[PDB]
Symmetry: C3
Subunit: 314 residues, 3 copies
């Protein structure tokens, strides 16, 4: 199978700059080279060059609307293209708002795709419920069908068409949800596994249930959108919105090795890796490293070991 | 439902001073304000003023008997009063010896109360089994019916009447028990989940079993006495007797969100938070913060999120 | 029952020196004294004096073959002797290559022994599959029956006779396996619980399965070979090959308390504790301490507490 790396050095989704340097740190860590050592075919599409939209006034509270909107539209295009060539797309980016384009793109080629959202937050704040204008915290609100019309159209996001419905997404790791975000996920009956459920069930059963929920009836493509802050700050400190009591390094990898086994991984996002937020070079390294392991894992790397077929090592 | 904060700045239960500053740190952390944002009605009773008993000679080994005794009698009174007004009592204190008064008080109004003791220690040392005279490690010995008469009456504790029996308490997190304390809990058939059981069952099944044990036949009130040292020093370092291999930040909260769901929380204690023991301001902050989260959790705060009823966020 | 401490200050299995200082650190931590406080009879055999084999040229890639070979032959002898006196042997060593002699020795007296290998690595690299010549990573290749003849005889290891077969060993904690090592463990159908299985099952069920696998039909002696790097660097940082996402302090102890309950512990190894690798005195202390706890645990120490029989503490 084919893999296509696509860097999304974008940070306008969050007021904190830095996440744009994420792709670099990741490539710099040996991601592309390491990936190539897998049973996969790796191609690097390079980092997308996003044109800034001058005098990008804020829509009500929403910040950098047109700039985010345009960057995503370009991402959706790119991804939609690789998806058209049946290759698996990997978006290494900055803030999570790029999930808009990554999925909206993926959807154009695979409308029946399921989404497993690993994050500490729901990121489903509609532009009317946000306490800030940060779009990085609103991706899902833009991807949901059940949310269309519930909030005023935003400048730059007219190209977007709700790609999936409430019954096609599953959150994992939630532990920092707003009153509105919470109201919404409950009101729409969106399946989710907060840290409380993971504690109760254990990541083992957790993954078991998410697969039976999403792949119970039909077997469709999987879009894993991984926000590195789905794990505990002790594993991925270098991020804009760290939250205590998260997923462990182990559960993170367990999540990715399962999705690998389903043979249905179609698209992956590795977001929020900000190298400029590590209190120490060890923390940045630490973040980049596990974020790479998550990617490698998704694509076949196993903790029990891996070996090439037809090779008699004895 | 009503909540009544009651500070117990007492430290005579342990030779280390500092736990008296605990209430401050907690209030100072925004506890009262944050609590008020819950579906509850919060009232702050302020910190109790404990009169020191001069020439408080030690009873055999027991230290500051009369001083502890009197402080508790005053606490039992206070608590017994709020309990009389059907409000939920919250004791923010110093050393755990105040559990004597918090429960003995709670009991006067709710004799059928169950007790979930989250701690790294059993704290059931009778004045005859203690290696030290520290009462902070003897609360339960004073609250048990099966332990009455087994040890010599102590000066200042004549007002106390065993509030509950061996079949009404459940320990969670035990991992540092003395030969005597152990002999006792085994001899009296006191249900408990040491860290070994939590490892085996997983906090999920652990909470499951404690509720079926305590609420199996009848549904009675719950008195959660939480020793912040039920968790690992990595989460609550600022405490007098830290012990490695404890409950995780996650398990602590899982414990409190369940007890919240039972709708039976009647009384809560948040003890052993000592701000003077943090090797660094981060450690003290760290302790105070999770101790607050435990409290907020107990009273409804959910990691999956919370939202107000009748509010259409869309 | 009798316990016999045997120090194996050997480091030629790994290019990094330091693990030879391990026995010291452990004794220096109070191991022997603390052990004596158990229901066991402790005897210290002292640290073995290993004669260096001059001009010990490398066999192909294998480094210090003759030196390792000779040291092990001496260890096998020693252990085989205490085993003959029905006492339980405890090898406190340096690199894991000493597992060769510890088990080969144990085997001579108990050929039906089962082996529970707690380590982050399989250490089953045959001299033909190693990327380095480090024997510390090849112990099992020398102990397996199914591996005999699969690799060229090594200078100094002619005295060795495969002590156990693929169906007599169980790995726990694996998370850093080589292509060849992996090919081998899969090709030989060797039961193992990688960190992925532990995540899935939970150390509780994990221990459950390993006992039914190894003790299902017959009840034989247990040789627990514990490589401190089976746990996460956060617990045992001071080691030559640390790997993230390992066993927790808790799971390590849970592993040992179960093996204790089986009443079948016959032989134990506590390897890879390198005091010269702790970035800070706290890290070295931290490693030594949990390594001691693992040992004490193996021999009866319980987290729920322990008390002497026939002693009425009241
Ligand atoms: N980029 C992110 N993942 N941000 C998290 C979004 C949730 C945040 N608490 C908000 O109110 O918007
Ligand atoms: N205040 C406390 N929680 N202390 C713990 C009590 C147990 C202590 N090891 C003792 O011997 O008394
Ligand atoms: N002494 C050890 N435990 N070393 C681990 C052995 C595995 C190592 N990666 C190798 O290739 O040999
Ligand atoms: F994000
Ligand atoms: F998020
Ligand atoms: F306490
Ligand atoms: F305690
Ligand atoms: F090793
Ligand atoms: F190893
Ligand atoms: Mn997030
Ligand atoms: Mn996110
Ligand atoms: Mn305690
Ligand atoms: Mn206590
Ligand atoms: Mn190892
Ligand atoms: Mn090893």
């Amino acid at each position: 199978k084919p893999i296509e790396i696509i860097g999304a050095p974008f940070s306008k989704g969050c007021p904190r700059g830095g996440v744009e340097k994420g792709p670099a740190a990741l490539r710099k860590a040996g991601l592309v080279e390491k990936l190539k050592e897998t049973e996969y075919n790796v191609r690097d599409h390079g980092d997308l060059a996003f044109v800034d939209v001058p005098n990008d006034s804020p829509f009500q509270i929403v910040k950098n609307p047109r700039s985010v909107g345009k960057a995503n539209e370009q991402l959706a295009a790119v991804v939609a293209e690789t998806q058209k060539n049946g290759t698996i797309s990997v978006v290494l980016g900055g803030d999570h708002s790029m999930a808009i384009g990554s999925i909206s793109g993926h959807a154009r080629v695979h409308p029946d795709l399921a989404v497993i959202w690993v994050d500490a937050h729901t990121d489903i704040n509609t532009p009317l419920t946000t306490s800030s204008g940060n779009l990085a915290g609103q991706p899902v609100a833009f991807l949901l069908k059940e949310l269309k019309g519930k909030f005023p159209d935003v400048p730059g996001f007219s190209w977007v068409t709700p790609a999936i419905s409430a019954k096609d997404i599953v959150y994992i790791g939630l532990r920092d949800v707003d009153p509105g975000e919470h109201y919404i996920i409950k009101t729409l009956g969106i399946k989710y596994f907060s840290m409380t459920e993971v504690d109760k069930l254990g990541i083992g059963k957790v993954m078991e249930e998410t697969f039976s929920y999403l792949l119970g009836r039909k077997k469709r493509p999987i879009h894993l959108s991984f926000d590195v802050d789905g794990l505990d700050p002790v594993f991925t400190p270098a991020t804009g919105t760290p939250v205590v009591g998260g997923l462990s390094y182990r559960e993170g990898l367990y999540i990715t090795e399962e999705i690998y086994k389903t043979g249905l991984l179609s698209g992956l996002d590795i977001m929020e890796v900000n190298p400029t937020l590590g209190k120490t070079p060890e923390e940045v390294t630490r973040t980049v490293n596990t974020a790479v392991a998550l990617t490698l894992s998704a694509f076949g790397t196993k903790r029990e070991g891996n070996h090439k077929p037809e090779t008699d090592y004895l």
